[PDB]
Amino acid sequence: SVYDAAAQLTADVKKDLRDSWKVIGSDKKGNGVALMTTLFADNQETIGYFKRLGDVSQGMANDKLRGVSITLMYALQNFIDQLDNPDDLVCVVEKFAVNHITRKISAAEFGKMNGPIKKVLASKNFGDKYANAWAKLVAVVQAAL
Amino acid sequence: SVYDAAAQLTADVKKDLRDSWKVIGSDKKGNGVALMTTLFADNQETIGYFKRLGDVSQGMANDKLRGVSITLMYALQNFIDQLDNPDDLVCVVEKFAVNHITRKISAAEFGKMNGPIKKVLASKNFGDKYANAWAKLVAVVQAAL
Ligand code: HEM
Ligand code: HEM
């Protein structure tokens, strides 16, 4: 359950999330677009869910893609900000899950963002320890899907 | 159209938006809920759009309402952060407008948030000058609806 998943965010996991976000969250536009373009490159099958965006290969030059990419980073910002209060983290995660459920995004589908996150993290000198930390946060959302 | 509305965001207006946000945005849960509950109190009819939230009379105590309220504040955070780049502000405003258009929320209906905003600002001692600045930000989003 989402409540059990949130409890998996231990002290050190929370710390690693904050430490890496401090760097990653510094460039929301750049890292956000990198996240999306990597998702579409490594998992081309997900492009169908983003028909509204148009030609996704344009990257940064695609206004709709840039809009979604920047907005995506503020969702991550939101999650990180709620790490101190599990009750708040959960209600925000559930809200966030509602819109993805409406788009029929499964927990398995949602989990594909883990690849992109791991790569962007590694490009900034953050290794497996951090990728695993972020995977735990993603799992919280997966539990609500 | 959206670009044209963003043009009213002059140097002075952006300055007041940033200064007032520094305070208002420092308690996203508290002020976010204040905005929502005030909207519902002053315009009871807007509750019709939030049936999914359940018993909104519970306010802060309502997990779903609290979830929407906190998240709402991150949309504003997004906008404030994009003020110095019209291109980015526009793509993020248009993305934001997509979900509200799907909900059949007209520009006039969206404008009802001006009252709550003015009242929340007043509670932190930000007068009409600041309320006017925020009305202009709301006008940019209204231009997309
Ligand atoms: C770290 C993981 C993810 C985060 C934090 C995230 C965040 C967001 C946010 C905040 C929005 C914009 C608000 C909204 O329209 O609901 C959004 C839109 C969307 N997301 Fe996710 N998302 C994630 C992963 C994914 C994945 C992996 C898929 C699909 C395989 C997905 C599919 C969608 C779709 C289709 C939209 C609508 C885009 C549009 O038409 O504007 N998301 N996501
Ligand atoms: C400053 C003004 C406003 C801001 C920044 C704002 C922000 C947001 C955000 C961030 C979301 C979550 C993402 C999404 O589902 O689209 C949202 C959801 C929503 N907003 Fe707005 N909004 C504003 C005003 C309004 C107004 C005035 C109405 C109605 C008259 C409205 C109706 C909705 C509805 C119905 C939802 C869905 C709530 C749910 O069931 O989860 N919004 N809004």
From Swiss-Prot, chains A, B:
Binding site for heme b: 100
Domain Globin, residue spans: 8-145
GO molecular function term, any single one: oxygen binding
Keywords annotated in UniProt: Cytoplasm, Heme, Iron, Metal-binding, Oxygen transport, Transport
Superkingdom of this protein's organism: Eukaryota
Leader sequence residues: none
Location relative to the cell: Cytoplasm
Keyword Transferase part of the UniProt annotation: no
Gene3D superfamilies for this protein: Globins
Matching Pfam families: Globin
PANTHER family: BLR2807 PROTEIN, GEO09476P1
Subunit structure: Homodimer.
Name of this chain's protein: Globin-1
Source species: Anadara inaequivalvis (Inequivalve ark)
